[PDB]
Write a protein that binds this DNA or RNA. Structure first.
Ligand SMILES: Nc1nc2c(ncn2[C@@H]2O[C@H](COP(=O)(O)O)[C@@H](O)[C@H]2O)c(=O)[nH]1
Ligand SMILES: *C(=O)[C@H](CCSC)NC=O
Ligand SMILES: [Mg+2]
Ligand SMILES: [Mg+2]
Ligand SMILES: [Mg+2]
Ligand SMILES: [Mg+2]
Ligand SMILES: [Mg+2]
Ligand SMILES: [Mg+2]
Ligand SMILES: [Mg+2]
Ligand SMILES: [Mg+2]
Ligand SMILES: [Mg+2]
Ligand SMILES: [Mg+2]
Ligand SMILES: [Mg+2]
Ligand SMILES: [Mg+2]
Ligand SMILES: [Mg+2]
Ligand SMILES: [Mg+2]
Ligand SMILES: [Mg+2]
Ligand SMILES: [Mg+2]
Ligand SMILES: [Mg+2]
Ligand SMILES: [Mg+2]
Ligand SMILES: [Mg+2]
Ligand SMILES: [Mg+2]
Ligand SMILES: [Mg+2]
Ligand SMILES: [Mg+2]
Ligand SMILES: [Mg+2]
Ligand SMILES: [Mg+2]
Ligand SMILES: [Mg+2]
Ligand SMILES: [Mg+2]
Ligand SMILES: [Mg+2]
Ligand SMILES: [Mg+2]
Ligand SMILES: [Mg+2]
Ligand SMILES: [Mg+2]
Ligand SMILES: [Mg+2]
Ligand SMILES: [Mg+2]
Ligand SMILES: [Mg+2]
Ligand SMILES: [Mg+2]
Ligand SMILES: [Mg+2]
Ligand SMILES: [Mg+2]
Ligand SMILES: [Mg+2]
Ligand SMILES: [Mg+2]
Ligand SMILES: [Mg+2]
Ligand SMILES: [Mg+2]
Ligand SMILES: [Mg+2]
Ligand SMILES: [Mg+2]
Ligand SMILES: [Mg+2]
Ligand SMILES: [Mg+2]
Ligand SMILES: [Mg+2]
Ligand SMILES: [Mg+2]
Ligand SMILES: [Mg+2]
Ligand SMILES: [Mg+2]
Ligand SMILES: [Mg+2]
Ligand SMILES: [Mg+2]
Ligand SMILES: [Mg+2]
Ligand SMILES: [Mg+2]
Ligand SMILES: [Mg+2]
Ligand SMILES: [Mg+2]
Ligand SMILES: [Mg+2]
Ligand SMILES: [Mg+2]
Ligand SMILES: [Mg+2]
Ligand SMILES: [Mg+2]
Ligand SMILES: [Mg+2]
Ligand SMILES: [Mg+2]
Ligand SMILES: [Mg+2]
Ligand SMILES: [Mg+2]
Ligand SMILES: [Mg+2]
Ligand SMILES: [Mg+2]
Ligand SMILES: [Mg+2]
Ligand SMILES: [Mg+2]
Ligand SMILES: [Mg+2]
Ligand SMILES: [Mg+2]
Ligand SMILES: [Mg+2]
Ligand SMILES: [Mg+2]
Ligand SMILES: [Mg+2]
Ligand SMILES: [Mg+2]
Ligand SMILES: [Mg+2]
Ligand SMILES: [Mg+2]
Ligand SMILES: [Mg+2]
Ligand SMILES: [Mg+2]
Ligand SMILES: [Mg+2]
Ligand SMILES: [Mg+2]
Ligand SMILES: [Mg+2]
Ligand SMILES: [Mg+2]
Ligand SMILES: [Mg+2]
Ligand SMILES: [Mg+2]
Ligand SMILES: [Mg+2]
Ligand SMILES: [Mg+2]
Ligand SMILES: [Mg+2]
Ligand SMILES: [Mg+2]
Ligand SMILES: [Mg+2]
Ligand SMILES: [Mg+2]
Ligand SMILES: [Mg+2]
Ligand SMILES: [Mg+2]
Ligand SMILES: [Mg+2]
Ligand SMILES: [Mg+2]
Ligand SMILES: [Mg+2]
Ligand SMILES: [Mg+2]
Ligand SMILES: [Mg+2]
Ligand SMILES: [Mg+2]
Ligand SMILES: [Mg+2]
Ligand SMILES: [Mg+2]
Ligand SMILES: [Mg+2]
Ligand SMILES: [Mg+2]
Ligand SMILES: [Mg+2]
Ligand SMILES: [Mg+2]
Ligand SMILES: [Mg+2]
Ligand SMILES: [Mg+2]
Ligand SMILES: [Mg+2]
Ligand SMILES: [Mg+2]
Ligand SMILES: [Mg+2]
Ligand SMILES: [Mg+2]
Ligand SMILES: [Mg+2]
Ligand SMILES: [Mg+2]
Ligand SMILES: [Mg+2]
Ligand SMILES: [Mg+2]
Ligand SMILES: [Mg+2]
Ligand SMILES: [Mg+2]
Ligand SMILES: [Mg+2]
Ligand SMILES: [Mg+2]
Ligand SMILES: [Mg+2]
Ligand SMILES: [Mg+2]
Lengths: 95, 240, 122, 159, 46, 147
RNA sequence: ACCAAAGCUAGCUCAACAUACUAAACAAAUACAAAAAUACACCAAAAUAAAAUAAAACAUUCACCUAACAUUAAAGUAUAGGAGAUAGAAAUUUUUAUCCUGACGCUAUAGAGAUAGUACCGUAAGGGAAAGAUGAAAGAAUAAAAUAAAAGUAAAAAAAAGCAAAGAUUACCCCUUCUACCUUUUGCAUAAUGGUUUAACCAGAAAAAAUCUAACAAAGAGAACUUUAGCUAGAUACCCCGAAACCAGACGAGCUACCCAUGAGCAGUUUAAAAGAACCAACUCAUCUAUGUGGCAAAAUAGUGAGAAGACUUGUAGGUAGAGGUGAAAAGCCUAACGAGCCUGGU
RNA sequence: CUAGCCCAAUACCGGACUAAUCUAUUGAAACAUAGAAGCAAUAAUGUUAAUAUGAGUAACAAGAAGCCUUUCUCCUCGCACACGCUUACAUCAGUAACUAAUAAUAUACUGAUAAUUAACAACCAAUAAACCAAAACAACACUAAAACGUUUAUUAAUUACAUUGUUAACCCAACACAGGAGUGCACCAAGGAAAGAUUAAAAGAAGUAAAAGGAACUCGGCAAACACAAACCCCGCCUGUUUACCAAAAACAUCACCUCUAGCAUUACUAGUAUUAGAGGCAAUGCCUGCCCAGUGACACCAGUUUAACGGCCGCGGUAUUCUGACCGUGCAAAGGUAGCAUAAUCACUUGUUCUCCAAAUAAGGACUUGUAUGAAUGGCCACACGAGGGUUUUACUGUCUCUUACUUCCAAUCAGUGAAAUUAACCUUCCCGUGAAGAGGCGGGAAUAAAAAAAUAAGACGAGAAGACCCUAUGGAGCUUUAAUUAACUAUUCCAAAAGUUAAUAACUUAACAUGGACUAGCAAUUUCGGUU
């Protein structure tokens, strides 16, 4: 991670995390299961469904991705016909 | 710094000129040829290799010169001979039996009858018999005897076809040239030059040969008895 | 090591290094190796006659000085040529093409002591 | 002068490469200057000449930034000066041929005040300006004589 | 054998190797003189 | 003779801007404490009989204003020459226009003196931020009700 | 009581403005071997930056890296990437004239290296210092006053026993008790490291997310953004020294390796011999031993040895320069450290 | 129990205070509230400066007397020039201190004043022609073929005195350094002084002499000696060269013999031309160099040829009573190690066995010899001469030794002057046993114990010196080699395109010098790397 750039002096972001991850506005990160396209003839339908299912990240990985991304990717996006707009918020979280 | 050559002498002279040796160093100063340097001080005796060279252009006919002395030359392995004709003398490469007080002929005339080949005589290849031993042969008419000069070495005339003479060099290679190329008859002096025995490692230093390197090098594929066929005949005639 | 700050004179070199000390040349080298000195190259000191010269190296202390008036080209012209040219123009014979009568020199290469090339040392 | 990837693969080695043009020693004839120059030209030069339909046409049309040749700029300057001066030394025995040659290049006629400054570099231009402005210092005698004449004329007219 | 005396003085070699003319006859020696002038050396050459 | 390990590095600019409402509230608090501590005096037109600074000195000593006095006028060019010449020779008596009022100077000077137009101007300038919008563009640009 | 200690100045540093930018001196001599008045010429040259580093390796890649477009945003966005490390725009937006310029910069181990690029060290490129303190008056030195405070000594050497001290004691020791300190370790009195001592210098630095405090609050921010209590401001944080190395450009063959010119030496004896013969001087090498080992010497002395008309020693001058030169190959020598010189820069 | 301020600590984490500076406001016998930092040193073989220990220790010097610079006692590198240093040279004066490693005073410090005078040396003609015939007492010759010159013709300002180097005790080595230094003269007619003054301990260095023995010492006869001789092997033919600074050799080179590569011109080779010139191997000479092109190279662009090219030259079993195997069976190879020598400088077994040498030998020499790992130009066998090469004998000789001793000089000790170095946490710095980070002056249990010098010996302080060079680790290097992985530039091939062109009624064909783009085969080479547990 480049904490201080050379041109603008700003903090940069890694593009791998934005290529293979998705941040919901509530702080959660969404990802794909590793190996969901490799050797599908060798795996059971239940395992294939487990691989095709999306998954969340835990607190340490989420904080790592927040450190590796800038503030532009932590904004509120109002997309037209966004499937994850219902998941952008959190409800009934009694902490 | 770049050095200048010692060969800055345009006027031909019979007196020996001093020459500056250089051991393998090019004009830059770096070694180009290894094993050269530190010989005996030598002078240079300018040799006239264009044998048929008349004094004045008014009489371009054949001419006869007289041998004054056959002397030793440290620059080449052969012996030199001073020949005088008219108002000038010149150094030539003496033949095997050329002694003081001989007459040498220099001719450029070719006739239907072959001439009797003596030793000091120099006729074009088209006028010599078919089995004549020759030396100081030429490549082009008037170019100069670049070929056979070494002591004892001599080539042989093989045949003359279509006004072109074929000779055979000491390397057993055939050389085709025009028949108007002048050539001296006989063998070059000092026929016993190959039989000389360097008595010690100091005679090589006298001659100016530095010792070989001490690095041991393993032989490669180049080594071994390569029985290669004789290369084709080297022709110098320009066929249009 | 050797010294670099000291001056490089003729005393500090080999026998083949003989550099002059600043004197001017007085001739050339002849035939048999000797030096031929030319009498035209040696400076001829032109000394005047100081017999009846009533002037001393010092002046009277009570003698007054003068205000500094450095002599200029305009002042010299006004002193040597302005009266002559003025009289000539008043008489009506002024010739702008010929100015040699007033002291002007067209080309310096004619006379002995020229001013721009400075042929004379002193 | 640049770099290249061997085997045309990015992940392979990077190697410095110098691409050079194919030079040719050709003889080109000019109509305005009437001389055959043995010049080292390229196939692109010959193609530009054939496209401009003439050596002089190509020289007069392609500017300095497209010529990139001091010799080409000198040729252009020479032919421009010749066109601006109407040089009779082109064909002293053929005035009709000279006029016919000068007519077909009428589109590039530049006056003399600018025809002698096109094929010059900065150093050459400064040298030319110095040679033009090189004037010997006039003696102060002349200036003082002029001043005195002015004062005398003033005193003569004020009476 | 014994070292330390590697400097044998000779004015000809000195002035021919590190002289003013030797420095000025090459573009690199001119750069040497320019560097010494920029530093302000009292002696630019031998 | 070596370098410094960390040391000071180049010209350092200690620059930051407090929020505008925070600065306005600071001005308000300065005025309020100056009034509540009996150290604020309202005058009229800031007129003086003479240009004698000793006159102002004796007047402040008689009125028990204190050692330091800051007189705030409405405008700069509208200042009377009498008070101008009286304050140009004094140190503890400082004359400032209305746009030059600041918390630092108000705390430095023991007594504050305000004219009636200056009081009106300060009130109008300070009360505007209590019911204003956030600047869409800088207030130097044309707004609907703002100059 | 000596040694000593303390000054406040010389001057520097960072910016602003600015004429618009190679200061002054240039009588003569100065690119002959610089400072040498004076003879028929030659003069000039360009061809990409590399690597040290990061990718915890290293092969594609690795911002700045001696090339102008500045500022507010877009935006660290699109994009480019062993799609890894990292790199990174643009379209489009904002920027009101002059003075108000000095210092919460240093005070002689600091601030420029500087009293100076000078002494000095190197053949050269190059490296590069330290050193000042009275007073109004020293044209007031039978000269006057403040500290007499570091380590080191003197005044004044020591008396059984012991990490040197503490508990104490009428009493210095005598009695009793405690295995120096940092660092590194499972564990050090450890006989594991470091330090004679004194003085002066010498080593934690960044605000993404967070906590605290405060302003305003569905809105906050003095323009561009963030917002389902949020927005703005402030305060809280991340050292020093050290390689062998790598690359680029200069400077080095006055030592040494080898060559090119130009010179010089070899006396006596045996030999038809100047025979790469023999004995042995000058001379040149350095076999063995003993001294020396911070020495006379960063390679020497003494004795003893080998060659000694030659492939011999040696003077002067020139050439070959490091991705190289040279080498009767010892991976030798190339200015006292050469499996590849030294200096500068990258750093 | 009596009072309280009411419970230990390494890495990391949290908090409250706070020394000294600067700034904004207080204060004015030196402070308070805030804001800032070049904000705090018992520790980096830390940097600079000064001080101690070692230590007044190591080390350093001037021949004698005298009437004071005159005579005696000794050793003999002196004079000049070239190169180099620049005044250090000369006269007078002073030296408390600075230079002499100490004084006296002075060529070496200080100040003033003077000096090196050209005949010697430096700078000191070109353009053409006649000119082959060495220097070495040069008469005349040898081979390695050899620097050094006149004359003739055309122009060479023409006229005293030009300019420059002239000292020295000196240069290069940090030094007033036992070192390094070219040339011509002589070996003294010129240069100098080994001892500052005493005593005569040890140990150390140098020398001389030594009864009887004469290598018995020792790895070795190293060193020394009244000796300074004769032989035998190994390795190199020989002279010679090499790791400046631990190896001079058996290493390299070498004459000779063999291989390859080249038919040719204006800067090497070469002003040469195959009896020549380069790239190499091995080593004079003598006898020889046996078989193999299977693999890898090189020519041949495929076959095919090449080993004095890189390199290789065999198993298993039985056989002539009892030991071997002339012989045979079978199998693989490209050939299956030939001649020679052989326990060697040749893996181990090995101190192989045997004879000579000695009283005794793992030493030396001669023989036997599969050396299953010798071997024939990466050369094999003998031989002359040679070698500071490595071993072995015979006398001679001797302090090497049995077995040391005596005396001198330098050292040494005292006196006088001057005066360093590594080292050092602080020491008020014993022995034994035990314990303990596993070897104690410091701990435990006991013994010993007035305090300080001076001279000796080195058992310990795991003594000093050099951030172990051996070993390992590092995703640290560098040199070298390639059958490591990616492949540049350059040099040699070849091909295509480009360019120039030529033939015929769209086709075929050639490239002197350069020379551009893209491919191919090789040299020269470039970048990088060498998984981990053990
Ligand atoms: N890893 C670890 N090291 C410890 C711990 N306690 C002490 N140490 C280590 O032990 C050493 C100090 O020993 P202590 O002071 O604990 O006796 C240090 O190296 C310290 O880091 C622990 O709990 N964990
Ligand atoms: C071996 O024990 C070692 C020898 C190293 S020399 C190559 N000695 C000391 O470390
Ligand atoms: Mg020859
Ligand atoms: Mg000959
Ligand atoms: Mg050979
Ligand atoms: Mg060899
Ligand atoms: Mg110097
Ligand atoms: Mg001289
Ligand atoms: Mg001299
Ligand atoms: Mg004269
Ligand atoms: Mg030196
Ligand atoms: Mg500093
Ligand atoms: Mg890396
Ligand atoms: Mg790292
Ligand atoms: Mg590595
Ligand atoms: Mg690395
Ligand atoms: Mg880079
Ligand atoms: Mg891609
Ligand atoms: Mg990776
Ligand atoms: Mg300073
Ligand atoms: Mg300094
Ligand atoms: Mg004290
Ligand atoms: Mg006690
Ligand atoms: Mg341990
Ligand atoms: Mg221990
Ligand atoms: Mg310790
Ligand atoms: Mg350790
Ligand atoms: Mg430590
Ligand atoms: Mg220590
Ligand atoms: Mg933040
Ligand atoms: Mg690299
Ligand atoms: Mg030399
Ligand atoms: Mg002799
Ligand atoms: Mg001899
Ligand atoms: Mg000796
Ligand atoms: Mg002896
Ligand atoms: Mg001797
Ligand atoms: Mg001898
Ligand atoms: Mg001998
Ligand atoms: Mg040289
Ligand atoms: Mg390399
Ligand atoms: Mg090399
Ligand atoms: Mg070797
Ligand atoms: Mg080796
Ligand atoms: Mg060196
Ligand atoms: Mg308790
Ligand atoms: Mg606790
Ligand atoms: Mg404070
Ligand atoms: Mg600090
Ligand atoms: Mg301290
Ligand atoms: Mg140490
Ligand atoms: Mg120490
Ligand atoms: Mg310290
Ligand atoms: Mg002392
Ligand atoms: Mg003493
Ligand atoms: Mg002692
Ligand atoms: Mg002593
Ligand atoms: Mg000197
Ligand atoms: Mg003294
Ligand atoms: Mg003196
Ligand atoms: Mg003299
Ligand atoms: Mg004595
Ligand atoms: Mg003496
Ligand atoms: Mg003495
Ligand atoms: Mg003794
Ligand atoms: Mg003795
Ligand atoms: Mg004796
Ligand atoms: Mg005896
Ligand atoms: Mg014995
Ligand atoms: Mg014994
Ligand atoms: Mg001996
Ligand atoms: Mg003997
Ligand atoms: Mg004997
Ligand atoms: Mg030998
Ligand atoms: Mg022989
Ligand atoms: Mg040699
Ligand atoms: Mg050695
Ligand atoms: Mg040697
Ligand atoms: Mg030796
Ligand atoms: Mg030897
Ligand atoms: Mg050999
Ligand atoms: Mg033979
Ligand atoms: Mg061999
Ligand atoms: Mg042989
Ligand atoms: Mg064979
Ligand atoms: Mg084959
Ligand atoms: Mg085959
Ligand atoms: Mg035998
Ligand atoms: Mg064996
Ligand atoms: Mg024995
Ligand atoms: Mg074998
Ligand atoms: Mg063998
Ligand atoms: Mg072989
Ligand atoms: Mg021998
Ligand atoms: Mg020898
Ligand atoms: Mg030997
Ligand atoms: Mg005795
Ligand atoms: Mg004690
Ligand atoms: Mg313990
Ligand atoms: Mg331990
Ligand atoms: Mg014990
Ligand atoms: Mg005890
Ligand atoms: Mg005890
Ligand atoms: Mg007991
Ligand atoms: Mg001891
Ligand atoms: Mg001792
Ligand atoms: Mg101890
Ligand atoms: Mg020990
Ligand atoms: Mg030790
Ligand atoms: Mg270590
Ligand atoms: Mg070691
Ligand atoms: Mg090792
Ligand atoms: Mg690792
Ligand atoms: Mg690396
Ligand atoms: Mg490969
Ligand atoms: Mg790379
Ligand atoms: Mg490598
Ligand atoms: Mg490994
Ligand atoms: Mg391992
Ligand atoms: Mg193991």
């Amino acid at each position: 991670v480049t904490y201080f750039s050379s041109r603008k002096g700003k903090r940069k972001t890694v593009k791998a995390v934005i290529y293979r991850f998705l941040r919901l506005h509530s702080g959660l990160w969404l990802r794909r299961k590793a190996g969901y396209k490799k050797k599908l003839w060798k795996k059971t339908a239940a395992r294939k469904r487990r691989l095709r299912e999306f998954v969340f990240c835990n607190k340490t990985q989420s904080k790592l991705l927040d450190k590796m991304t800038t503030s532009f990717w932590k904004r509120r996006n109002w997309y037209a016909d966004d499937p994850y707009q219902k998941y952008q918020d959190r409800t009934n979280l009694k902490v | 710094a770049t050095s200048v050559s010692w060969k800055s002498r345009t006027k031909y002279t019979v007196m020996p000129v001093k020459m500056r040796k250089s051991g393998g160093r090019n004009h830059t100063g770096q070694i180009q040829v290894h094993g050269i340097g530190g010989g005996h001080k030598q002078r240079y005796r300018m040799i006239d290799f264009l044998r048929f060279r008349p004094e004045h252009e008014s009489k371009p006919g054949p001419f006869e010169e007289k041998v004054i002395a056959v002397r030793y030359d440290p620059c080449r392995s052969a012996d030199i001979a001073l020949v005088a004709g008219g108002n000038r003398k010149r150094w030539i490469i003496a033949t095997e039996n050329m002694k003081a007080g001989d007459t040498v002929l220099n001719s450029d005339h070719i006739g239907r009858m072959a001439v009797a080949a003596r030793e000091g005589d120099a006729h074009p290849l088209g006028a010599l018999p078919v089995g004549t031993l020759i030396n100081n042969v030429e490549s082009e008419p008037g170019r100069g005897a670049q070929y056979i000069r070494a002591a004892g070495t001599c080539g042989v005339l093989l045949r003359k076809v279509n006004g072109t003479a074929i000779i055979q060099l000491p390397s057993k290679r055939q050389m085709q040239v025009l028949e108007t190329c002048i050539a001296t008859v006989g063998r070059v002096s000092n026929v016993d030059h190959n039989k000389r025995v360097i008595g010690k490692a100091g005679r090589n230093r006298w001659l100016g040969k530095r010792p070989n390197s001490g690095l041991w090098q393993r032989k490669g594929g180049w080594a071994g008895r390569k029985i290669r066929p004789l290369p084709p005949m080297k022709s110098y005639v320009k066929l249009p | 090591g050797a010294d670099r700050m000291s001056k490089w004179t003729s005393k500090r070199g080999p026998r083949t290094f003989c550099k002059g000390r600043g004197a001017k040349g007085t001739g050339f080298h002849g035939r048999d190796g000797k030096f031929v000195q030319i009498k035209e190259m040696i400076p001829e000191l032109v000394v005047p006659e100081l017999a009846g010269f009533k002037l001393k190296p010092y002046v009277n202390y009570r003698a007054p000085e003068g205000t500094d008036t450095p002599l200029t080209a305009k002042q010299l012209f006004l002193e040597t040529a302005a009266p002559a040219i003025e009289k000539d123009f008043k008489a009506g014979t002024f010739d702008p093409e010929h100015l040699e009568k007033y002291g002007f020199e067209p080309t310096q290469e004619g006379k002995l002591f020229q001013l721009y090339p400075k042929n004379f040392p002193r | 002068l640049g770099h290249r990837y061997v085997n045309n693969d990015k992940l392979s080695k990077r190697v410095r490469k110098v691409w050079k043009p194919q030079l040719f020693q050709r003889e080109l004839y000019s109509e305005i200057l009437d001389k055959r120059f043995t010049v080292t030209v390229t196939m692109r030069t010959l193609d530009l000449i054939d496209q401009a339909c003439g050596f002089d046409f190509y020289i007069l049309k392609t500017p300095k930034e497209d010529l990139c040749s001091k010799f080409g700029m000198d040729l252009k300057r020479g032919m421009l000066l010749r066109l601006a001066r109407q040089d009779p030394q082109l064909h002293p025995d053929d005035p009709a041929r000279r006029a016919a040659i000068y007519d077909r290049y009428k589109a590039f006629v530049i006056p003399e005040a600018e025809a002698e400054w096109v094929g010059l570099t900065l150093d050459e231009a400064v040298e030319k300006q110095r040679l033009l402005e090189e004037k010997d210092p006039i003696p102060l005698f002349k200036i003082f004589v002029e001043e005195l004449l002015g004062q005398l004329q003033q005193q003569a007219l004020s009476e | 054998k014994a070292r330390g005396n590697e400097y044998q003085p000779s004015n000809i070699k000195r002035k021919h190797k590190h002289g003013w003319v030797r420095r000025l006859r090459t573009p690199t020696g001119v750069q040497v003189i320019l560097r010494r002038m920029h530093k302000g050396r009292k002696s630019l050459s031998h | 003779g070596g370098g410094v390990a960390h040391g000071p590095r180049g010209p350092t600019s200690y620059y930051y801007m407090l929020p505008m409402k925070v600065r306005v509230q600071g001005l308000k608090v300065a005025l309020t404490v100056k009034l509540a501590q009996d150290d604020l005096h309202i005058v009229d037109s800031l007129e003086l009989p003479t240009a004698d600074p000793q006159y102002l000195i004796e007047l402040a000593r008689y009125r028990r204003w204190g050692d330091s006095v800051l007189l705030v006028d409405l405008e700069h060019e509208d200042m009377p020459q009498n008070v101008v010449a009286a304050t140009s020779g004094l140190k503890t008596f400082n004359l400032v226009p209305a746009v030059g009022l600041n918390v630092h100077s108000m705390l430095k000077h023991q007594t504050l003196v305000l004219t009636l137009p200056t009081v009106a101007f300060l009130e109008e300038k300070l009360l505007w931020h209590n019911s204003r919008y956030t600047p869409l563009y800088p207030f130097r640009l044309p707004y609907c009700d703002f100059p």
